[PDB]
């Protein structure tokens, strides 16, 4: 999956070394952002509007 | 992508297995070996080496 996300970075025109050299940062941002989805959907019923 | 046939390391185009010997022409450098989760040790060939060794 760290090599798939390095293809996803290459696709947007960000050179793939930007992923592997920041991989813990990118993983912790994805994990934190997935955390915000649960709080959004739990707190606010109009998200499903 | 980098791949191994079990003994040697190659770079291939992604969508068709065509193994190219790893060189400074099909690879680019960044930083050093510390920062990457899953990096492997191998030689990378310099196409200018036999031209300089002559």
Swiss-Prot record, chain B:
Effect seen on changing residue 8 to Y: In strain: Theta/P.3
Glycosylation sites: 5, 41
Outcome, altering residue 25 to H: In strain: Alpha/B.1.1.7
Source domain of life: Viruses
Function of the molecule: Subunit of the fusion protein that is processed upon entry into the host cell. Mediates fusion of the virion and cellular membranes by functioning as a class I viral fusion protein. Contains a viral fusion peptide that is unmasked after S2 cleavage. This cleavage can occur at the cell membrane by host TMPRSS2 or during endocytosis by host CSTL. In either case, this triggers an extensive and irreversible conformational change that leads to fusion of the viral envelope with the cellular cytoplasmic membrane, releasing viral genomic RNA into the host cell cytoplasm.
Protein name as catalogued: Spike protein S2'
Species of origin: Severe acute respiratory syndrome coronavirus 2
